[PDB]
Design a protein around this ligand. Sequence first.
Ligand code: HEC
Ligand code: HEC
Ligand code: NI
Ligand code: NI
Lengths: 106, 106
Amino acid sequence: ADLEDNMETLNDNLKVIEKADNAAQVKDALTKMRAAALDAQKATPPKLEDKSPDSPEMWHFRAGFDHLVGHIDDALKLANEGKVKEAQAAAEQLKCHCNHCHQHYR
Amino acid sequence: ADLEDNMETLNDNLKVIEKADNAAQVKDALTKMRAAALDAQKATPPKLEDKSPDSPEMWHFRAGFDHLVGHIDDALKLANEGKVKEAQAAAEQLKCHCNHCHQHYR
Ligand code: HEC
Ligand code: HEC
Ligand code: NI
Ligand code: NI
């Protein structure tokens, strides 16, 4: 959808992952998070409306989603190994990506 | 100084900023962190000793310090413009940079 919908999706599924106790639930939530992050990367945040596409600010904004997606992919691999707790710990650590982008651009 | 020397400097001074009794101590600690990070950026982590200066792992390692230096510079700017409580709040967010790189390479 749009950036507000993608953001609550990300937040909702972090909670799902912390709640869960098996690999399938974690995998499903991470998969949902991955789609939301890639969709949000296409948007321009309101505080960067007139910035150029390759501007330093737009570059760092887009890079933040690439990096979030990379670490979602890393947590997905752990869940696919049956390493539930390690996948959950990796998911919890995604909050650093949320907070970093927010402090720049939210 | 080698890598774990720089890491001790980063660890000690991040704690100084949180506990500092005055603003001059915040700036001085941020300055020491910045120097340690730029030195550490020129190191090879032991888990990557088998990688070239061009490996994707060495690239992400170097970029982590670039980004940490940028955010130290942001906090230094707050401190230099007299907004030292804001600089302290920004320094607290630096721990995510530590945790992210450690997740990969520590
Ligand atoms: C940039 C690279 C971001 C990353 C990574 C994450 N978010 Fe985000 N978020 C971003 C912006 C620019 C905004 C402002 C939206 C606006 O239209 O002003 C937000 C906002 C949120 C919100 C609030 C939703 C709202 O309608 O205001 C939430 C709940 C949120 N973000 C959650 C969130 C989480 C949990 C993230 C990590 C998993 C995350 N975001 C990453 C930009 C970016
Ligand atoms: C990569 C870009 C890193 C960033 C950013 C930070 N650290 Fe780090 N740290 C990194 C590596 C590769 C290692 C292992 C070094 C080794 O030779 O094994 C470390 C290690 C530490 C340690 C342990 C020190 C030791 O004697 O082994 C500490 C206390 C430490 N790091 C602290 C630290 C802090 C507080 C950081 C943020 C401010 C931080 N590091 C960033 C790689 C990276
Ligand atoms: Ni990473
Ligand atoms: Ni940044």
